[PDB]
PDB file of C-alpha atoms in Angstrom:
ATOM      1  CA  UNK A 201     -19.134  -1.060   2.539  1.00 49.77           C
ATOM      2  CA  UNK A 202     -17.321   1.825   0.778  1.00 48.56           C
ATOM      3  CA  UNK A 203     -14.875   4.237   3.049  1.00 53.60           C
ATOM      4  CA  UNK A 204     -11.552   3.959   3.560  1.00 52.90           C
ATOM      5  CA  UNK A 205     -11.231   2.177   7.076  1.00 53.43           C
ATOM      6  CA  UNK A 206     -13.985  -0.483   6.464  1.00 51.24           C
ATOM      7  CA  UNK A 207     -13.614  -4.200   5.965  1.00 52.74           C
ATOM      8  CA  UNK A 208     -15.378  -5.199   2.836  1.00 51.94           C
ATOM      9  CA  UNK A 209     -16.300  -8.794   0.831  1.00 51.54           C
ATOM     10  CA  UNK A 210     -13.370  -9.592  -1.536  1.00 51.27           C
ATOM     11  CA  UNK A 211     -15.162  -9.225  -4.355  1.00 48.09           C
ATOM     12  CA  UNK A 212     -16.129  -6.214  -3.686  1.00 49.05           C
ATOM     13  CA  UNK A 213     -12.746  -4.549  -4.054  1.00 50.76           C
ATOM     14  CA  UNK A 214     -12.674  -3.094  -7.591  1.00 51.39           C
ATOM     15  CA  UNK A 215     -11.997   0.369  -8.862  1.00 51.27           C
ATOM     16  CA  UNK A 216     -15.485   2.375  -7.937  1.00 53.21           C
ATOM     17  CA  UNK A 217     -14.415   1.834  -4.628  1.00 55.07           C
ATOM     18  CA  UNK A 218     -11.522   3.230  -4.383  1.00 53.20           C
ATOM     19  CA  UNK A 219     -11.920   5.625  -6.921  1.00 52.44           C
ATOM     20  CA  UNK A 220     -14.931   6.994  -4.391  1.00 51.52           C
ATOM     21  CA  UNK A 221     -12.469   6.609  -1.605  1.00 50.09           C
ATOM     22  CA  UNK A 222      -9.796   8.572  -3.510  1.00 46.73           C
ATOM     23  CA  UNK A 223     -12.232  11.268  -4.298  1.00 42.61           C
ATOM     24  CA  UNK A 224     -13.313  11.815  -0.479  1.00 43.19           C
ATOM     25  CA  UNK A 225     -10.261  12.776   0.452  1.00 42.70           C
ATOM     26  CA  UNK A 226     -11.033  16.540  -1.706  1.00 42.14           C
ATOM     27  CA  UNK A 227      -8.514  19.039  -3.625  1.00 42.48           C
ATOM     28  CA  UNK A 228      -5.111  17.828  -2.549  1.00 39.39           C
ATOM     29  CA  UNK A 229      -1.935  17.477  -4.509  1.00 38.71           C
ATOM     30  CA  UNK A 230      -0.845  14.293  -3.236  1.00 37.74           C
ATOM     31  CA  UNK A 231      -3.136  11.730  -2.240  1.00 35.61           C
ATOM     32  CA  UNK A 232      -4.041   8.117  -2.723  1.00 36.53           C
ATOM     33  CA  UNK A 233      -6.478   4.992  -2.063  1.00 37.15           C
ATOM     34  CA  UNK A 234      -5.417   2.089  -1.312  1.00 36.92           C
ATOM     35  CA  UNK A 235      -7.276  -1.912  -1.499  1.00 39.84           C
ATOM     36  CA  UNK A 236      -6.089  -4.799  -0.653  1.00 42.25           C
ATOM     37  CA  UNK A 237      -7.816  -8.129  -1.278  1.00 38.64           C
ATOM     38  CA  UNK A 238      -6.891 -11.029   1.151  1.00 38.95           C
ATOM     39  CA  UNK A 239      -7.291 -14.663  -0.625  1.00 37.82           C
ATOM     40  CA  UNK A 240      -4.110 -15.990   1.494  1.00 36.74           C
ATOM     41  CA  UNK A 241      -5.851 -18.021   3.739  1.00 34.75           C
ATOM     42  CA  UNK A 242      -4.183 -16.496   6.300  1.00 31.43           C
ATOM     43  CA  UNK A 243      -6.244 -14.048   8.769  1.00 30.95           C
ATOM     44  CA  UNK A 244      -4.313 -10.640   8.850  1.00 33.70           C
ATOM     45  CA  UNK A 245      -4.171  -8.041  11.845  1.00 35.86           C
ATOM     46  CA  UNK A 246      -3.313  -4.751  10.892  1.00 31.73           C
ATOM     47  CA  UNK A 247       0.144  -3.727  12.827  1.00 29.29           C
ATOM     48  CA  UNK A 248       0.899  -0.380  11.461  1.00 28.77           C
ATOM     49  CA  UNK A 249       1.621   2.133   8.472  1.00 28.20           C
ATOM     50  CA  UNK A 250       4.639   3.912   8.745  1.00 33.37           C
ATOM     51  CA  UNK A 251       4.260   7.295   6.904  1.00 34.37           C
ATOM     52  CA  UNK A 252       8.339   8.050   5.642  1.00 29.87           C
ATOM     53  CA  UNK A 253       6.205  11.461   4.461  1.00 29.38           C
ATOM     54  CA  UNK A 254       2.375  12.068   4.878  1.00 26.54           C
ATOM     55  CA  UNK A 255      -0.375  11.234   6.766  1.00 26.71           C
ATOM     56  CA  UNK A 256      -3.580   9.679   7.248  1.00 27.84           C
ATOM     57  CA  UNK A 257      -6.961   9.816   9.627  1.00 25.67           C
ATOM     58  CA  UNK A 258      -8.135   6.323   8.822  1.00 24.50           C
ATOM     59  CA  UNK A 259      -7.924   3.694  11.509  1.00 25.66           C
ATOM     60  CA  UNK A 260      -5.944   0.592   9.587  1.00 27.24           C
ATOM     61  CA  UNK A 261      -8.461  -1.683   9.627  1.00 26.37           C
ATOM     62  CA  UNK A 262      -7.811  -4.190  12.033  1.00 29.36           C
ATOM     63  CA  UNK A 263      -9.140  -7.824  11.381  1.00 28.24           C
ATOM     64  CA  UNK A 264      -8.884  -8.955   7.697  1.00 27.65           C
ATOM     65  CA  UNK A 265      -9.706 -12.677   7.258  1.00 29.89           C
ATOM     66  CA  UNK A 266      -9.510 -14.925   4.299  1.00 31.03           C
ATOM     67  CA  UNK A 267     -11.963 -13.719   1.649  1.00 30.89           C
ATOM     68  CA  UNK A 268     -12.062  -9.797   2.818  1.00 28.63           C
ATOM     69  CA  UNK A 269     -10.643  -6.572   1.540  1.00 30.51           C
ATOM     70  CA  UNK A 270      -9.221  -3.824   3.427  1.00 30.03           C
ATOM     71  CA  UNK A 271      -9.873   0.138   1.999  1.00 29.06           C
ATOM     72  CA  UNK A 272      -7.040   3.329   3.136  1.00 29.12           C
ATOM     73  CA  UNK A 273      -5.950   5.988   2.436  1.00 28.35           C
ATOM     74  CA  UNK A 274      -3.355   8.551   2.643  1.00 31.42           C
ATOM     75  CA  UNK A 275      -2.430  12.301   2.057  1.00 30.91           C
ATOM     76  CA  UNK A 276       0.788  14.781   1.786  1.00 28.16           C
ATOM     77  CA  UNK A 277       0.967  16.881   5.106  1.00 27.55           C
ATOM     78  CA  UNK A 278      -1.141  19.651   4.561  1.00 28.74           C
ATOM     79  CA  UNK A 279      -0.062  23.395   4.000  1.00 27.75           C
ATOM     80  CA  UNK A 280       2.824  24.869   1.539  1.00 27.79           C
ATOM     81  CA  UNK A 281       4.885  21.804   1.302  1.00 27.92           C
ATOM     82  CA  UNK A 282       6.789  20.035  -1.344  1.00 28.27           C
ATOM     83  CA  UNK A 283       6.187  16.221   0.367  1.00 31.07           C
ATOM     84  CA  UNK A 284       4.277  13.544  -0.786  1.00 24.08           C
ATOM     85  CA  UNK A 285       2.403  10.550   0.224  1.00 23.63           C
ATOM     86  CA  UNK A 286       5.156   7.699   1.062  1.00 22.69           C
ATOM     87  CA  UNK A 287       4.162   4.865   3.794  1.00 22.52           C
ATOM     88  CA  UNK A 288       4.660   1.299   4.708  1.00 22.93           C
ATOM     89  CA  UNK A 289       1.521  -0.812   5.849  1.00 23.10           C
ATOM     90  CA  UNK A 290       2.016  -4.036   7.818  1.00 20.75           C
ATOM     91  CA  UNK A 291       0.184  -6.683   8.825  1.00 16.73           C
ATOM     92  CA  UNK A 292       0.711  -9.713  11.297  1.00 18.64           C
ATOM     93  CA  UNK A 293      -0.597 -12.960   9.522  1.00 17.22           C
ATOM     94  CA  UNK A 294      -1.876 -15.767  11.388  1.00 15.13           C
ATOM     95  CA  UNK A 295       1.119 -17.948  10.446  1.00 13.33           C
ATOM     96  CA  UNK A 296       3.160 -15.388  12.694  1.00 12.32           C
ATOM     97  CA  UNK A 297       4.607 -13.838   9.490  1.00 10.51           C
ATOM     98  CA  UNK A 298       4.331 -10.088   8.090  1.00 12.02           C
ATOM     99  CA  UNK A 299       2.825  -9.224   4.973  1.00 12.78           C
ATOM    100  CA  UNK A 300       4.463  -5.509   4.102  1.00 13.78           C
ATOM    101  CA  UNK A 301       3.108  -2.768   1.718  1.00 14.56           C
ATOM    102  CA  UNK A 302       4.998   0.091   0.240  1.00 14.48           C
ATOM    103  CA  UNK A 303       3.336   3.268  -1.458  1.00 13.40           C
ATOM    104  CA  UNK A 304       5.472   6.137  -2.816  1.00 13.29           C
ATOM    105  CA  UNK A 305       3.400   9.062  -4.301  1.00 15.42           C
ATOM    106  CA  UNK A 306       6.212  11.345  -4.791  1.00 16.66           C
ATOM    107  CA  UNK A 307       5.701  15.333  -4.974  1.00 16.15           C
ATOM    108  CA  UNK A 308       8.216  16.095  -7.784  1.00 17.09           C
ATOM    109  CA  UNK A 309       7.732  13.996 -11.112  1.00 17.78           C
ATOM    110  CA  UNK A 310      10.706  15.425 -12.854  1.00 21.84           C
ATOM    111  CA  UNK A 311      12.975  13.260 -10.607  1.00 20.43           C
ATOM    112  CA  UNK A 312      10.685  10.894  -9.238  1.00 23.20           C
ATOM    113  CA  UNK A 313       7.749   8.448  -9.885  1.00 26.47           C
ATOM    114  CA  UNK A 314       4.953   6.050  -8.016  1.00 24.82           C
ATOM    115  CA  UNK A 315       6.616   2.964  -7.133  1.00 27.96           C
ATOM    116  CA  UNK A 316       4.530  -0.192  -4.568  1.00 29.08           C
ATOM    117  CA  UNK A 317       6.158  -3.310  -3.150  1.00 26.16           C
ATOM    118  CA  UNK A 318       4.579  -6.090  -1.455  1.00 25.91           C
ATOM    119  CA  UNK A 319       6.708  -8.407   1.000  1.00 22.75           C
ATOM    120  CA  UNK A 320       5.858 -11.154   3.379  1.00 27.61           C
ATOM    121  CA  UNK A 321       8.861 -11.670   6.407  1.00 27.46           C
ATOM    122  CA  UNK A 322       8.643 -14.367   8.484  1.00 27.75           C
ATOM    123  CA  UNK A 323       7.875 -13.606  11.921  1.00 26.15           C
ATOM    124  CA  UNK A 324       6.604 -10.005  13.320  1.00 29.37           C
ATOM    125  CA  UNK A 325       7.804  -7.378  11.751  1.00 25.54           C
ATOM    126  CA  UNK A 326       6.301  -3.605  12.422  1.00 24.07           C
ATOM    127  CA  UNK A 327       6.671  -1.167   9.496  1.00 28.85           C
ATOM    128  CA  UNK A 328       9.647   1.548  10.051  1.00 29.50           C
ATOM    129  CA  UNK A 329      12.083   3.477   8.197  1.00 26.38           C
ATOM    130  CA  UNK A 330      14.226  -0.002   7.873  1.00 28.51           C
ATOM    131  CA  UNK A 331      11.390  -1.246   6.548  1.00 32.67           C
ATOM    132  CA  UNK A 332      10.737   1.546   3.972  1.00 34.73           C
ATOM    133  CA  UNK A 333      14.592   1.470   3.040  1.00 40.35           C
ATOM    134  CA  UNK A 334      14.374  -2.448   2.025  1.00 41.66           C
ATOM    135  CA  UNK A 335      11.132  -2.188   0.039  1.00 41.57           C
ATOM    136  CA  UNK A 336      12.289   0.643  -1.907  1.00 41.61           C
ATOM    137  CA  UNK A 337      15.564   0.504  -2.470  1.00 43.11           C
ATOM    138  CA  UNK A 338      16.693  -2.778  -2.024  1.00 42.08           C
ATOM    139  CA  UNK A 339      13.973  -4.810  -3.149  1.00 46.03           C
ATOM    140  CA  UNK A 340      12.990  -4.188  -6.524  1.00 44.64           C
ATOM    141  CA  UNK A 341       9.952  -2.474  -6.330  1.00 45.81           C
ATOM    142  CA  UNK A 342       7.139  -2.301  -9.090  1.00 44.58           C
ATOM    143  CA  UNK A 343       6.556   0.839 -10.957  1.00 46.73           C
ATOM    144  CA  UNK A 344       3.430   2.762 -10.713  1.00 49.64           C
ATOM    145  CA  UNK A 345       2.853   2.210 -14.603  1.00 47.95           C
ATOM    146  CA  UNK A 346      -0.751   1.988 -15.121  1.00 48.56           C
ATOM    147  CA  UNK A 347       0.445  -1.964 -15.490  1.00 46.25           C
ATOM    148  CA  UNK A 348      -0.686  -5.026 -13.377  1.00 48.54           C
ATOM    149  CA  UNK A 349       2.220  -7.043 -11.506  1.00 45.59           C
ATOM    150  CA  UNK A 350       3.036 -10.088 -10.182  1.00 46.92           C
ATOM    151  CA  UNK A 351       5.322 -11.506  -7.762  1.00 48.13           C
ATOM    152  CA  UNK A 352       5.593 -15.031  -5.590  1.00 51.93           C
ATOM    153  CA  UNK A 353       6.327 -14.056  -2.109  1.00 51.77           C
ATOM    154  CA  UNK A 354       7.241 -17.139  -0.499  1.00 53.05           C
ATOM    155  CA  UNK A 355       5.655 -18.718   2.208  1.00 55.58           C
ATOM    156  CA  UNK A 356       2.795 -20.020   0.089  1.00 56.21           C
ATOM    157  CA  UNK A 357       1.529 -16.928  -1.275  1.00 58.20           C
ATOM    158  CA  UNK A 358       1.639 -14.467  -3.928  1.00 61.60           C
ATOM    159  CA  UNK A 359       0.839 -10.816  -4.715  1.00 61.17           C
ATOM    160  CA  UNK A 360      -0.820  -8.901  -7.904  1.00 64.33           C
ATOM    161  CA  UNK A 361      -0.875  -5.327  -7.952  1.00 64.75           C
ATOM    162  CA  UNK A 362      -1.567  -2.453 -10.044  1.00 65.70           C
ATOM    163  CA  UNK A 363      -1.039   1.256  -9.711  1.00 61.97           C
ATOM    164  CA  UNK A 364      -1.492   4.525 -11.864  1.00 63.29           C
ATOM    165  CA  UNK A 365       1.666   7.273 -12.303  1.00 63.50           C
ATOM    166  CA  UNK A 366      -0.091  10.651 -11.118  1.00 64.55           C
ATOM    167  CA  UNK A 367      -0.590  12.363  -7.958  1.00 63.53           C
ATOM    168  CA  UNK A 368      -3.552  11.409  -7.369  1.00 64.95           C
ATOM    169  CA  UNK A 369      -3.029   7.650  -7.174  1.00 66.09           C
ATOM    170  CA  UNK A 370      -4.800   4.110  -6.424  1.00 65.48           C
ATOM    171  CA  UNK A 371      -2.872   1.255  -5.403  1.00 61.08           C
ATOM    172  CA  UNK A 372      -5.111  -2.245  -5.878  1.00 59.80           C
ATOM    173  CA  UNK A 373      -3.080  -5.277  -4.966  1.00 58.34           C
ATOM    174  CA  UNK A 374      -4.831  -9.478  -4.055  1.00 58.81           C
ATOM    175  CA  UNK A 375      -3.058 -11.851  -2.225  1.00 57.89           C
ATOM    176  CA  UNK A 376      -3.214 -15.198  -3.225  1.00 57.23           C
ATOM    177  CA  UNK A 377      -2.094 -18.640  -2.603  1.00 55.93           C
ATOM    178  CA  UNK A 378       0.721 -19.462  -4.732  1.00 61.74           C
TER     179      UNK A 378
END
């Protein structure tokens, strides 16, 4: 597969994809694809994305077992606004914990930049504004750098992830066993 909303081999996650993914979503200020590459072990189920600002039409995709990647994406609300693209997807992992993703796409680069996070909290957590507030402020996010980083998350695992600085951005992160 290809589209943002499908369920695709692991392997198959690289940057055509989501490059193609990005691209689908037209002439829009703010806008990005996101991948995510499960090697955990763990089978995820999607929960939710919380959008702090933006939107998106995909369906999360909902069953993500060991060896598969997940495609999304996201835009700014449409129309004369100065927002950006700014969410928190989470999943419930078949060891009854949470694996949490932040994206920040931010409309105003003179203040701001791209920043991602990846979490994992025990138990069942669904992504909200709490949840934004911890992965952004108070938990050290990563940069949107055009840089790859890595991270142990507990619980076994750990989390790569790269993501470039512009407006139109693409967020690729794999979760692995520690």
């Amino acid at each position: 597969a290809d589209v943002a909303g499908a369920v695709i081999d692991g392997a198959g996650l690289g940057f055509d994809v989501l490059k193609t993914v990005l691209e689908a979503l037209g002439n829009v200020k703010r806008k990005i694809a996101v991948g995510i590459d499960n090697e955990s072990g763990k089978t995820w189920t999607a929960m939710n994305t919380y959008f702090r600002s933006g939107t998106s039409d995909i369906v999360l995709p909902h069953k993500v077992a060991h060896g598969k990647a997940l495609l999304y994406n996201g835009q700014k609300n449409r129309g004369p606004v100065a927002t950006g693209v700014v969410g928190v997807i989470a999943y419930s992992m078949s060891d009854g914990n949470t694996l949490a993703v932040l994206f920040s796409v931010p409309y105003d680069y003179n203040w701001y930049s791209n920043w991602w996070n990846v979490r994992v909290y025990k138990g069942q957590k669904r992504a909200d504004q709490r949840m934004y507030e911890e992965l952004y402020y108070h938990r050290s996010p990563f940069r949107g750098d055009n840089g790859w980083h890595s991270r142990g998350l507990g619980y076994g695992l750990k989390s790569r992830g790269f993501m470039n600085s512009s407006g139109h951005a693409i967020l690729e992160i794999h979760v692995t066993k520690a």
